């Protein structure tokens, strides 16, 4: 299982770890994609996460797309998780460098409250623009389920936990 988090709150863990290092070792049941509307993994976590499927994720996430459309921000889907977890949960965040709603950032986390557990990135963080400590503050206030955090940058990760209240 799981090993090397900090535990901020009775439901909510945090690790200075890589996402894609930490999927292939933990192999967890759901990890959580920094997806956009449009399912297109090009950069930050969703990139790193696919290029890690050898593009398995893209190729399955463009047919999701011709079938279904666009997620909603805010919204999700449950996809194969490939060679990193048994499901990738595809969780959009407000991307506050294309102007949107940070507001949506509680429904993007609401969609965590579907899975017992998650592997997961701070949603809307990295070049979604938001801030990180707003981010893990609505995290932790808005996830009831047991969510294991990963933050790619130690900086970073001292800067969250250290400011955490
Ligand atoms: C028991 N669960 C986890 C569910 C069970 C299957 O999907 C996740 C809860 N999750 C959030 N808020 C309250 C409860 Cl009781």
Redesign the pocket.
């Known amino acids: 299982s799981f090993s090397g988090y900090l535990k901020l709150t009775d439901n909510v863990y945090i690790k200075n770890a890589d996402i894609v290092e930490e999927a292939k070792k933990v192999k967890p049941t759901v990890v959580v994609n920094a997806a956009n509307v449009y399912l297109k993994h090009g950069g930050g976590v969703a990139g790193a996460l696919n290029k890690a499927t050898n593009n398995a994720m893209q190729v399955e996430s463009d047919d999701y797309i011709a079938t279904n459309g666009p997620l909603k921000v805010g919204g999700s889907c449950v996809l194969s998780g490939h060679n990193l977890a048994k499901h990738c949960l595809h969780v959009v965040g407000p991307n506050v460098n294309k102007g949107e709603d940070i507001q949506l950032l509680k429904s993007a986390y609401e969609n965590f409250?579907?899975?017992?557990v998650l592997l997961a990135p701070l949603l809307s963080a990295g070049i979604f623009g938001a801030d990180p400590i707003h981010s893990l503050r609505v995290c932790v206030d808005t996830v009831?389920?047991n969510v294991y955090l990963a933050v790619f940058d130690k900086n970073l990760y001292d800067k969250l936990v250290s400011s955490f209240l």
Do not use: A, D, G, W
Request: aromatic residues 0%.
């Open positions: 409250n579907q899975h017992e009831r389920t």
